[PDB]
């Protein structure tokens, strides 16, 4: 029953094709609730979940202005980072940031997060103390010095312990019917002969929310980690997620295998077998 709020910012340069595109999306747990895209015909922070639509015009104006200011500041950051790495003006580069807070069942701050990446590599992260930075390299040290000077960490601490937690609590209450509803997986085991000698047992979990799930195969009560093909958890498109785990078993040994499912929506963790 712990919960997270996160924002994900992506700025990507595209020399010869206009100014760097800035995108921002906001999530509570696995539910996206806002987006901004500088490439939109008329850029504004827009709702992506029913429970945020009740926020008034002052909400939408604040979030839009922040995004518009970010679009400009990220383009400045990208030019700066291009300089920090002695890079040509000809290449495309990406800057990403993800930040937010985690709260426990009582709604108290468990921890805050703020991390940035440049071209997919860790660049600078706010430490868990919310008061110092970890810089990945000598370029990120220049940013760290700027941010220290501007007293950024103190701003992040205030936000993370304050507005982040307060607004996550409000969103959780406003969207309680969905954000605080865990939907358990619908589970089944299918069997697909590979050859005379072997078959695939595939354990499915469908329709679950949130995405966090554990699917394991055991043979004679021993976990089959090395032998299990586990696909990435994937969105169904209706808020829910899907996952499966597969093992190749010798023919006639199917009953030695059990599929185990843990999900917070489940009254009790499930043990499943192929039922021919």
């Amino acid at each position: 029953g712990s919960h997270s709020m996160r924002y994900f910012y992506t700025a990507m340069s595209r020399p010869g094709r206009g100014e760097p595109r800035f995108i921002a999306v906001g999530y509570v747990d696995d539910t996206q609730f806002v987006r901004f895209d500088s490439d939109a015909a008329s850029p504004r922070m827009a709702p992506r979940a029913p429970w945020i639509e009740q926020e008034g015009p002052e909400y939408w104006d604040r979030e839009t202005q922040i995004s518009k200011t970010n679009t400009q500041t990220y383009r400045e950051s990208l030019r700066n980072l291009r300089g920090y790495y002695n890079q040509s003006e000809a290449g495309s580069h990406t800057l990403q940031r993800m930040y937010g807070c985690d709260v426990g069942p009582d709604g108290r701050l468990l921890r805050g997060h703020d991390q940035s990446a440049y071209d997919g590599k860790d660049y600078i992260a706010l430490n868990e103390d919310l008061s110092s930075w970890t810089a990945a390299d000598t370029a990120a040290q220049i940013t760290q010095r700027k941010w220290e000077a501007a007293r950024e960490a103190e701003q992040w601490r205030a936000y993370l312990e304050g507005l982040c937690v307060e607004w996550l609590r409000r969103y959780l209450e406003n969207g309680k019917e969905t954000l605080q509803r865990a939907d358990p997986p619908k589970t089944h085991v299918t069997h697909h002969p590979i050859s005379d000698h072997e078959a695939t047992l595939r354990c499915w979990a469908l329709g679950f929310y949130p995405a966090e799930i554990t699917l394991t195969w055991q043979r004679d009560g021993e976990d089959q980690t090395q032998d299990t093909e586990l696909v990435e958890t994937r969105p169904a498109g209706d808020r829910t997620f899907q996952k499966w785990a597969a093992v190749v078993v010798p023919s006639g040994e199917e009953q030695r295998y059990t599929c185990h499912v843990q999900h917070e929506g489940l009254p009790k963790p499930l043990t499943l077998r192929w039922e021919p």
């Binding site: 924002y7 979030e63 922040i66 500041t73 700066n80 800057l95 600078i124 941010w147 507005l163 607004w167």
Partner: peptide, 9 residues
């Protein structure tokens, strides 16, 4: 809600 637009890198 978002953090205020942060300082340039």
């Amino acid at each position: 809600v978002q953090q205020e637009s942060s300082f340039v890198m």
